[PDB]
């Protein structure tokens, strides 16, 4: 299925077409049934009066069928709470995700009535519902999707970016939804390398025993009992003289069995999704680099499978991390933070990055801190904290803050015999999601001298049985000021 | 220990002899203490009056010693409920299984007073108590067992069949009781091939990577993490021009650790017994083919070990089955149904079987449906359902019906990304044992156009620490009309 | 909200009307867009061609909107499995239950195109979706519902019965949905007495200490720690000279905390629904007696609350039942079977009933035997077993059989010091749901000399957060031959 | 034991004296061993050189003995993270709480070298270590404690306030530490009434059946199964013409067994502490009103015991709250939010409060959001959120923000039959601690038109086996601008 975003209502192809109209109630109230909109809608809506009559009756928000199978109106609420995004983009996903198109549909046509500040989140929300991945052996249909944005200020360059963002969103979700017997560490390295090639990146791949020899103890020791070997992949977009040097470090655990401290019968399904951080960072990097990204930018992907054999990590094991510090592993399922400790140290030490983001499906505890729609951000930099929350609101990839207090909470990871433990299996003073992030930061002085932000996306990376494609929209809005894209600037 | 069934009371060898007399109360009441019976019993019972006095006193059923160590009378109840077998054959097993014979016993002599409809189940029940398998390093004794049936209608050919049935029962139980460090997949293939040779079968063995290449995704992917490789074994008894074409498909999981969704500390012991279906089908095939079986008959054994390594099945994995359909594995311990989906498809597609039975120690849930004495049968064919229940009653291998409703229950296995999941780990609309069977049937249109019967024997395949040898008696009575055996015809 | 069933399409009141059309695909294919149907549907469907075009496109089954908010077509599948009802009535409930009507809807008009054998189950399925009970403090709307049945053979008397059946269904569900702080034992006694008065019944109420004095040890000892006292209520419809004498005994546990063997935090919610058996028997009795029921009929309601105090049942307690037999209570949460043992003994001994039905939300184990749509029936009478399965199919209140084997399974309830225990907390030979029923039957010789049927409806009595109103439709079809209703005769 | 705070080092009584010196490293480095300090310290520290030598050697923070039993120096760190308080007051508690004084100690003398912004938190931290409550039958000693603050800017009025704050802190902790067989609902009403009398408050007590009659369904129904009756206590400090009208609503669950959804064997100990919110609000009110509080102020205490009997709340029960809204109780252990829903509605409706704080030991989930040192604040007012975080830093009673999103999260409490449920026992979209607060706010439109702040203090209210006395310091700093106290103004 192909998704194209266009600036203004235009005709779609020949072939059976499903029509979905999307807007906030206040915007829809002001839409005139005339012109190109009338041309598109009058198959399903009789005339202007019937249009106006319907808009009068329908509530503050919801989904209303305009035909027995081919057409829908989605009303987005106007009101929002301060913890929400004022775009209410999640409401589009909620109403749209259930919709199925008749078997012989060729085209899906969206007419999106969105004000300029809403366009990006609304487009992304629609894109997320076009799930690339299926292994069904019948019934597979490819559709031609046009998202036609009705918004004065939108440029043609904006529409290119939104098409690329839609792709980055759907790619992130595809990578997440693919089972790990197919998306192995090798396959995810190959996926990253494809983006590396497309973006003209400098590509570094350190794999298997090369990781051990190079001192990547976290990445190596976590992944050594996988069926295919661990890897660290760097895509670098180097801009001579750039003022910023930004790293996007992603957790790429292609499957997490928990390791020898194994997950339960009901805990282990869904664990193909434990690489959602790496997928989201990779696809964010792709969207940004496609649009004239003016600063130096690196994607650093820590790609392992956490599995069970006599050579696997065992609780009590002490390993030496890339940083040179020792970690006592008391929880083999707290493996993401080990691999990210190496990725973030590499970004600081080797890449000389001065802004380091890491994003990970890190903890089940994250949902108890920020719920299922907000990623949980922990940073040494207060201004960056405010800025990423603002970016979450503008993108629809919501972000809530975690407490940053290494002085109060790092003692939760005290070890008698190593520099630290990787987890605490009892009562601790910190929120567990914060403590998990502090294990990562402990290998770069908790961000001292630079800006470091850890983002835990375990719950917002998925809804139901599907990846959401979280990450590309967030980082496009956060770092989009360094692109050529008018709506990001 | 050797077991011979004879038509009428006869002398036994020289050597210390244990005597066990068995009968329903009403039959025993009519036995005259004279003739050959008196000859055998008067070591232990004084005369006719003392015999009659005892029969008067003893209750409606039980076991009564006739000597301090050498002799017993077992009284079988006459009454039975409609859900039971009117043979009450389980009562013989209950009373007999505890009996031990003195160390220096050479012979065990049974005098079985049974009416013609009871003989087969009663003989089988006695046979089950002679457990072949032991690895004790002292105390091992081999006995000469004669089961002398006192029944007017019995023929000498019947006695040959009953001896063969006794062997098939004891062989099934031996295979079940043998620990899996000895009965590996390789060893069970060898056992099936021995029966293949003895029966003059056409033998097909597809093993290891040959399964993968041939498209047996269920059998291969389940067994790939075993210490010895997966196999599919077919023994074919082809009868040109036969009207029926019958397949006996058996679950041969030589050990089930549960896989990466591992069984618990108390759940995993006994899991050598997870090949009881394959053993019972193999030994049923053997008993039938020994007696002039007039229709085309196949034994199809799916032989795997379900174990734990980095290459094992993981929940989320999607595989392609022999049928070409995809299955999302969300439960690595729901492995029997995966391997049987291939076996049943093979029987339909390759063997052209038009009656397909599969029998398996499939689910713990089975005991909550049919209890511990009845196998649970699910079939698309109502007449076959009645016929197998009738066969259960006549054989003593009891069978109770499951609901057959793919329309109501198959939705329990819905998958977003594959054709189906293999299990449901939450609330479901179907009985879990039925849903387990429907996963198998989903790969042959739930039996459309043919007769398909799935039989879950998890609990009735064992009592205490011992296999019961369930299966040969059931299928001998069910399919015995196609043999030369008078009592089956 | 009022529900009226009419014989043929007729006009509805003034006021905003929602229209729902219901039929099997094959029936809908043959409907002509003319006459009264056209009059009703042409608000929403343009003309005959558009009607025919739509019917061509829509799949084998589902729900299709005919308007943005006011109208729906529900297509019922034609095909069904042998374990299902050929009415497919559950499909109506599945598609209809989600539908919401706009706030200002006055009328809901159903046009039901059903063949004669489908009408009763289809009407009941629609009725179940009109939930009487709500304590919402805004948004409450009462609707005028007309179910217009288009069926040649239907009589006006049939339509009266179907209206009464709809009421009995909705009343059963109302009683179930009402929280137990409102529907106390006292309140449920009052509800039964209201039906007693309306039906001109002879009414007996034995309450509190009168139960103890009268020897109702099961009912008394279970309910003695409730906040309001235990009761046994009998409504009798005595027909001099009748050939049959039928008792409907219902489990009326208004709330089940489990007792001192208390339910878990997640196990205890929903336990207001533990009186669903009593509600269903009461409302079945009501529907039958309204229609000239020609045999002697009794409703016997065992009404208790199972709660926690120093005077409550404790495991180890031994009580004397109405039967005079002693029961060792080893499970205070196996309380339904204790109260029903008294109700069934009373029906036999005092009422002289020769057909005794008991219906109960008895066991969580029931779903593992018969799933969530089928009640599980255990009876001493094979013909009655077949007849109730047939009644389940005709009514849509599905029934599946349990094994009846007191000889094999009653030993699961062996006690060293009382006549029996009420449960087995370990491994047992019977299906647990069957063993639960056998505790009841043990107090009437397992039905010896009469017909006894126990029906466990724990799961089919509810879907989601709502009672289904199971029971009235089943018993109307089972016992409707004794009424004046043409469609039941 | 009596605690007096003084402005400057002064002599203490006759009698054996323990000396504890407290300061940040940077402050201690600048202290001259002369004058009054030398007079006090030279018992334990030889002279200036030995003083300076020691200060040079000791690390950045810790505790160092100055005598074998009588004396200690506590060094407080200078550095702090942004999530911490820059006072580092918790470090004082950590080092001091372990200290024991010899049996015959009469006096404890603190010399506190603190800069003006640190004084309040440091004093409070010392006060918390003087635990009032003990029922030991030997070894009980009362001490005379003088905390001598060495700080230029401190006034004599400040020292009065700090003495009162010390008392409020120790009183809160005493109430918390007292077992509930002593601190019953009656006893806690009496405690509140004592403060009511001392402060010249208008006192309202609504108790037992008066709560039911007055419509306090939350307070009444939660507490009705306690051994002593539920109560609602209001202390009002009414200031004619005041611009603000502030309510402090506290959760006073004197013991929480969990109710019929009972707590576990290891979950139930410590549940005397479930009234920590009410204690902290009461003692905050006391400290503020003692110091010329210029605005209208109310303490509203919801005082219940949540226990187990046949009349207790049961999950499924639906009650009507003071607000008139209905709540379906699906979790009897989610009882604090029910009682607070009434308290907050009362504060809005009856008291006309326009700033409403509620504070509660509400959820175990709170520690997963904000950890064990920070209360978790959820408010409709962003400025108030910032202001209370600032107050947490200045007081040492730390506060972290929760997400405020009723639009996103209130759907977690959806009910089919009541206006809402009180909890969600499965997966929810919100942080569970936020959802718990939203149940409270749902009864006042989530704060619409006013300022509402909910503060969950479950973990920060205690360390080890002792109440911390959290709350008085926080509200003194938050609302101290309305007092006459120079250091608060
Ligand atoms: Na298809
Ligand atoms: Na020996
Ligand atoms: Na309303
Ligand atoms: Na002492
Ligand atoms: Zn993990
Ligand atoms: Zn992980
Ligand atoms: Zn298994
Ligand atoms: Zn298995
Ligand atoms: Zn119960
Ligand atoms: Zn019950
Ligand atoms: Zn509680
Ligand atoms: Zn509480």
From CA C231, how far away is CA C211, in angstroms rounded? 7
Helix (H, G, I), strand (E, B) or coil at A298: strand
From CA C153, how far away is CA D139, in angstroms rounded? 94
Q: Interhelix angle for D156-177 vs D472-479, to 10°?
A: 140
Of the candidates A108, C62, A467, A1, the one whose C-alpha atom is nearest the C-alpha of residue B417 is: A467
Please tell me whether residues A76 and A210 are part of one structural domain: no
C118 labeled part of a ligand binding site: no
Please say whether the beta carbons of D257 and D263 come within 8 A. yes
Query: CA separation (Å) from B142 to B103, B108, B125?
Result: 10, 10, 19
Residue-wise burial string across B216-247, b where 16 or more C-beta atoms lie within 10 A, e elsewhere: bbbbbbbbbbbebbbbbbbbbbeeeeeeebbb
Domain endpoint, select from A154, A188, A206: A154
Report how far apart the first and last C-alpha atoms of chain D are (Å, whole number). Answer: 30
**Residue D200 sits in a domain of what CATH number?**
3.40.630.10
From CA D217, how far away is CA D227, in angstroms rounded? 18
Please tell me whether residues A439 and A366 are part of one structural domain: yes
Q: What is the resolution of this structure in A?
A: 1.9
Instruction: Answer positive or negative: Cα dihedral of B75, B7, B81, C420.
Output: positive
Name D49's Cβ contacts closer than 8 Å, sequence gap at least 6. Answer: none
Please say whether the beta carbons of C449 and C146 come within 8 A. no
Alpha-carbon A121 to chain mean position: 13
From CA A392, how far away is CA C369, in angstroms rounded? 50
Query: CA separation (Å) from A319 to A233, A338, D427?
Result: 21, 10, 36
Of the candidates D159, D100, D156, the one whose C-alpha atom is nearest the C-alpha of residue D131 is: D100
Please tell me whether residues A149 and A206 are part of one structural domain: no
Please say whether the beta carbons of B191 and B282 come within 8 A. yes
Please tell me whether residues B265 and B398 are part of one structural domain: yes
**DSSP 8-state symbol, A480:** G
Phi and psi at B463, nearest 5°, equal -135, 125
Of the candidates C386, C399, C403, the one whose C-alpha atom is nearest the C-alpha of residue C438 is: C403
Burial class (CB in 10 A: 0-12, 13-18, 19+), C426: exposed
Q: Interhelix angle for A472-479 vs A276-289, to 10°?
A: 40
Helix (H, G, I), strand (E, B) or coil at B227: coil
Burial class (CB in 10 A: 0-12, 13-18, 19+), D457: buried
Phi and psi at A194, nearest 5°, equal -60, -45
Question: Residue C111, CB half-sphere, CA atoms under 13 Å: how many?
Answer: 23
Please tell me whether residues A137 and A185 are part of one structural domain: no
Among left, alpha and beta (phi > 0; psi -120 to 50; other), residue D169 is alpha
From CA C199, how far away is CA C177, in angstroms rounded? 24
Please tell me whether residues A88 and A128 are part of one structural domain: yes
**DSSP 8-state symbol, B134:** -
Instruction: Answer positive or negative: Cα dihedral of B288, B292, B297, B301.
Output: positive
Of the candidates C306, C263, C220, C264, the one whose C-alpha atom is nearest the C-alpha of residue D310 is: C306
From CA B247, how far away is CA C283, in angstroms rounded? 50
Please say whether the beta carbons of A327 and A317 come within 8 A. no
Please tell me whether residues B339 and B470 are part of one structural domain: yes
C158 labeled part of a ligand binding site: no
**DSSP 8-state symbol, B264:** P
From CA B283, how far away is CA B280, in angstroms rounded? 5
Question: Residue A341, CB half-sphere, CA atoms under 13 Å: how many?
Answer: 34
From CA B87, how far away is CA B22, in angstroms rounded? 13
| Residue numbers belonging to the annotated binding site of A for Zn(2+) | 251, 256, 274, 333, 335
The vertex-A357 CA angle with A352 and A360, nearest 5°, equals: 135
Query: CA separation (Å) from B464 to A73, B94, B177, B459?
Result: 64, 11, 11, 10
Helix (H, G, I), strand (E, B) or coil at A229: coil
Segments of A312-410 assigned E as strands: 318-320, 326-328, 355-360, 375-379, 399-401
Please say whether the beta carbons of B10 and B109 come within 8 A. no
Of the candidates A410, A432, A376, A437, the one whose C-alpha atom is nearest the C-alpha of residue D84 is: A410
Taking every pair of C-alpha atoms in chain A, what is the biggest distance, in angstroms?
77
Phi and psi at C202, nearest 5°, equal -75, 125
Please say whether the beta carbons of B219 and B230 come within 8 A. yes
Please tell me whether residues B87 and B189 are part of one structural domain: no
Among left, alpha and beta (phi > 0; psi -120 to 50; other), residue B265 is alpha
Name B138's Cβ contacts closer than 8 Å, sequence gap at least 6. Answer: none
- Is C touching D (3+ C-beta pairs, cut-off 8 A)? yes
Phi and psi at B358, nearest 5°, equal -125, 140
Which one of A268, A305, A462, A464 would you mutate to disrupt binding with B, by most B Cβ within 10 Å of its Cβ? Answer: A268
Helix (H, G, I), strand (E, B) or coil at A304: strand
Pairing of strands C245-256, C355-360: parallel
Name B84's Cβ contacts closer than 8 Å, sequence gap at least 6. Answer: B90, B398, C405, C407, C408
Please say whether the beta carbons of B208 and B303 come within 8 A. no
Task: Report CA Rg, chain C.
Answer: 23
Q: Which helix (H) or strand (E) holds A52?
A: helix A48-57
Name D184's Cβ contacts closer than 8 Å, sequence gap at least 6. Answer: D226, D227, D228, D254, D305
With an 8 Å Cβ cutoff, are C369 and B367 in contact? no
Please tell me whether residues B150 and B266 are part of one structural domain: no
- Show me where chain D is broken: residue before each gap, C-N > 2.5 A: none
- Given D365, D370, D403, which is nearest A83 (Cβ)? D403
Burial class (CB in 10 A: 0-12, 13-18, 19+), B57: exposed
Per the DSSP assignment, residues forming a β-bridge with B207 are: B231
Taking every pair of C-alpha atoms in chain C, what is the biggest distance, in angstroms?
77
Q: Which helix (H) or strand (E) holds A55?
A: helix A48-57
Helix (H, G, I), strand (E, B) or coil at B213: helix
Phi and psi at A377, nearest 5°, equal -105, 130
From CA B284, how far away is CA C237, in angstroms rounded? 57
- Distance (Å) from CA C138 to ligand 3 centroid: 5
- Given B317, B326, B416, which is nearest A466 (Cβ)? B416
Name D438's Cβ contacts closer than 8 Å, sequence gap at least 6. Answer: D378, D406, D409, D410, D412, D413, D430, D446
Catalytic site includes residue A36: no
From CA A258, how far away is CA A222, in angstroms rounded? 10
- Given C83, C409, C430, which is nearest B405 (Cβ)? C83
SS3 string, chain D, reads: CEEEEEECCCCCCCCCEEEEEEEEHHHHHHCCCCHHHHHHHCCCCCCHHHHHHHHHHCCCCEEEECCCCCEEEEEECCCCCCCCCCCCHHHHHHHHCCCCCCCCCCEEEEEEECCHHHHHHHHHHHHHCCCCCCCCCCCCCCCEEEEEEECCCCCHHHHHHHHHHHHHHHHHHHHHHCCCCCCCHHHHHHHHHHHHHHCCCEEEEEECHHHHHHCCHHHHHHHCCCCCCCEEEEEEECCCCCCCEEEEEEEEEEEECCCCCCCCCCCCCCHHHHHHHHHHHHHHHHHHHCCCCCCEEEEEEEEEEECCCCCCCCCCCEEECCCCCEEECCCCCCCHHHHHHHHHHHHHHCCCCCEEEEEECCCCCHHHHHCCCCEEEEECCHHHHHHHHHHHHHHCCCEEECCCCHHHHHHHHCCCCCCEECCCCCCCCCCHHHHHHHHHHCCCHHHCCCEEEEEECCCCCEECCEECCCCHHHHHHHHHHHCCCHHHC
Which residue in C has a C-alpha nearest to residue D334's C-alpha?
C265
Phi and psi at D297, nearest 5°, equal -140, 135
From CA B419, how far away is CA B321, in angstroms rounded? 11
From CA A74, how far away is CA D408, in angstroms rounded? 18
Question: Residue D447, CB half-sphere, CA atoms under 13 Å: how many?
Answer: 23
Please say whether the beta carbons of A315 and A260 come within 8 A. yes
Chains that touch C (3 or more CB pairs under 8 A): A, B, D
Q: What is the dihedral of CA B256, B260, B263, B265, to 10 degrees?
A: 110
Q: Interhelix angle for B432-441 vs B336-349, to 10°?
A: 40
Question: Residue D398, CB half-sphere, CA atoms under 13 Å: how many?
Answer: 25
Q: How far is the alpha carbon of C276 from chain D, nearest alpha carbon, in Å? A: 15
Helix (H, G, I), strand (E, B) or coil at A253: strand
Burial class (CB in 10 A: 0-12, 13-18, 19+), C140: exposed
Of the candidates A258, A304, A254, A261, the one whose C-alpha atom is nearest the C-alpha of residue A279 is: A254
Please say whether the beta carbons of B294 and B207 come within 8 A. no
Phi and psi at D393, nearest 5°, equal -65, -40
| Ligand with an atom nearest the CA of residue B332 | 7
Question: Residue C185, CB half-sphere, CA atoms under 13 Å: how many?
Answer: 29
Helix (H, G, I), strand (E, B) or coil at A297: strand
Please tell me whether residues D291 and D202 are part of one structural domain: yes
Q: Which helix (H) or strand (E) holds A340?
A: helix A336-349
Per the DSSP assignment, residues forming a β-bridge with A111 are: A21, A148
Please say whether the beta carbons of D460 and D470 come within 8 A. yes
Helix (H, G, I), strand (E, B) or coil at B202: strand
From CA B73, how far away is CA B92, in angstroms rounded? 11
Please tell me whether residues D108 and D171 are part of one structural domain: no
Catalytic site includes residue B265: no
SS3 content of chain B, % helix, strand, coil (to 5): 35, 20, 40
**DSSP 8-state symbol, A440:** H
Which one of B215, B222, B261 would you mutate to disrupt binding with A, by most A Cβ within 10 Å of its Cβ? Answer: B261
From CA C29, how far away is CA C51, in angstroms rounded? 10
From CA B443, how far away is CA B319, in angstroms rounded? 13
Of the candidates C407, C408, C388, the one whose C-alpha atom is nearest the C-alpha of residue C398 is: C388
Q: What is the count of structural domains for chain A?
A: 2
Cβ neighbours around C1 below 10 Å, total: 13
Q: Which helix (H) or strand (E) holds A206?
A: strand A202-207
Domain endpoint, select from A132, A154, A176: A154
Pairing of strands A202-207, A245-256: unpaired
The vertex-B332 CA angle with B327 and B337, nearest 5°, equals: 60
Task: Report CA Rg, chain D.
Answer: 23
Task: Report CA Rg, chain B.
Answer: 23
Please tell me whether residues C87 and C196 are part of one structural domain: no
Question: Residue D382, CB half-sphere, CA atoms under 13 Å: how many?
Answer: 4
Which residue range forms the structural domain that includes residue C483?
Answer: 155-489
Q: Which helix (H) or strand (E) holds A109?
A: strand A107-113
Domain endpoint, select from C154, C170, C202: C154
Name D266's Cβ contacts closer than 8 Å, sequence gap at least 6. Answer: none
Of the candidates D383, D390, D379, D387, the one whose C-alpha atom is nearest the C-alpha of residue D356 is: D379
- Is B touching C (3+ C-beta pairs, cut-off 8 A)? yes
Which residue in B has a C-alpha nearest to residue A273's C-alpha?
B316
Among left, alpha and beta (phi > 0; psi -120 to 50; other), residue B447 is left
Phi and psi at B156, nearest 5°, equal -65, -35
- Given D372, D380, D429, which is nearest A372 (Cβ)? D429
Phi and psi at C351, nearest 5°, equal -80, -15
Q: Interhelix angle for C119-128 vs C89-96, to 10°?
A: 20
**Residue D19 sits in a domain of what CATH number?**
3.40.50.10590
Among left, alpha and beta (phi > 0; psi -120 to 50; other), residue A323 is alpha
SS3 string, chain C, reads: CEEEEEECCCCCCCCCEEEEEEEEHHHHHHCCCCHHHHHHHCCCCCCHHHHHHHHHHCCCCEEEECCCCCEEEEEECCCCCCCCCCCCHHHHHHHHCCCCCCCCCCEEEEEEECCHHHHHHHHHHHHHCCCCCCCCCCCCCCCEEEEEEECCCCCHHHHHHHHHHHHHHHHHHHHHHCCCCCCCHHHHHHHHHHHHHHCCCEEEEEECHHHHHHCCHHHHHHHCCCCCCCEEEEEEECCCCCCCEEEEEEEEEEEECCCCCCCCCCCCCCHHHHHHHHHHHHHHHHHHHCCCCCCEEEEEEEEEEECCCCCCCCCCCEEECCCCCEEECCCCCCCHHHHHHHHHHHHHHCCCCCEEEEEECCCCCHHHHHCCCCEEEEECCHHHHHHHHHHHHHHCCCEEECCCCHHHHHHHHCCCCCCEECCCCCCCCCCHHHHHHHHHHCCCHHHCCCEEEEEECCCCCEECCEECCCCHHHHHHHHHHHCCCHHHC
Among left, alpha and beta (phi > 0; psi -120 to 50; other), residue D381 is beta
From CA C179, how far away is CA C174, in angstroms rounded? 10
């Amino acid at each position: 299925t192909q998704v194209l975003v266009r600036n203004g209502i235009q005709a779609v192809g020949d072939g059976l077409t499903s029509l979905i109209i999307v807007g906030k109630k206040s915007v829809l109230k002001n839409v005139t049934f005339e012109g190109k909109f009338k041309e598109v809608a009058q198959k399903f809506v009789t005339d202007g009066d019937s249009w106006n009559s319907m808009i009068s009756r329908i509530p503050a928000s919801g989904r209303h069928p305009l035909h027995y199978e081919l057409a829908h109106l989605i009303t987005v609420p106007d009101a929002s709470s301060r913890g929400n995004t004022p775009t209410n983009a999640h409401s589009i996903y909620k109403e749209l995700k259930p919709i199925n198109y008749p078997e012989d549909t060729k085209n899906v046509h969206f007419v999106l009535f969105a004000e300029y500040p809403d366009v990006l989140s609304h487009v992304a929300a629609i894109a997320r519902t076009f799930c690339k991945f299926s292994m069904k052996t019948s019934g597979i249909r490819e559709l031609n999707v046009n998202i036609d944005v009705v918004c004065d200020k939108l440029t043609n360059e904006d529409a290119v970016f939104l098409t690329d963002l839609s792709e980055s969103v759907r790619e992130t979700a595809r990578l997440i939804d693919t089972p790990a017997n197919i998306l192995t560490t090798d396959a995810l390295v190959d996926e990253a390398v494809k983006v590396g090639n497309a973006t003209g990146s400098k590509i570094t791949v350190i794999r298997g025993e090369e990781l051990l020899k190079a001192g990547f103890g976290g990445i190596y020791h976590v992944g050594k009992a996988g069926p295919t070997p661990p890897a660290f992949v760097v895509l670098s977009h180097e801009v001579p003289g750039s003022t910023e040097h930004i790293a996007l470090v992603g957790k790429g655990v292609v499957y997490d069995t928990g390791g020898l401290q194994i997950k339960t019968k009901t805990g282990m399904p869904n664990m193909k999704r434990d690489m959602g951080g790496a997928a989201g960072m990779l696809e964010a990097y792709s969207a940004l680099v496609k649009h004239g990204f003016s600063q130096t930018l690196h994607a650093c992907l820590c790609i392992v499978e956490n599995n069970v054999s006599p050579i696997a990590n065992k609780p009590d094991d002490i390993i030496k991390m890339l940083s040179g510090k020792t970690v006592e592993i008391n929880n083999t399922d707290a493996e993401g933070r080990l691999i990210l400790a190496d990725g973030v140290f590499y970004a600081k030490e080797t890449l000389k990055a001065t802004t380091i983001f890491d994003m990970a499906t890190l903890t089940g505890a994250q949902a108890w801190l920020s719920g299922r729609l907000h990623g949980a951000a922990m940073t040494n930099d207060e201004q960056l904290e405010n800025e990423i929350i603002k970016a979450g609101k503008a993108s629809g990839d919501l972000v809530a803050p975690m407490l940053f207090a290494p002085d109060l909470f790092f003692g939760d990871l005290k070890s008698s015999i190593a520099d630290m433990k990787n987890s605490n299996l009892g009562k601790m003073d910190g929120p567990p999601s914060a403590v998990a992030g502090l294990l990562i930061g402990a290998h770069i002085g908790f961000g001292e001298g630079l800006r470091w932000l850890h983002l835990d996306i375990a719950a917002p990376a998925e809804v139901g049985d599907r990846g959401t494609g979280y990450g590309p929209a967030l980082f496009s809005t956060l770092l989009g000021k360094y692109t050529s894209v008018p709506m990001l600037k």
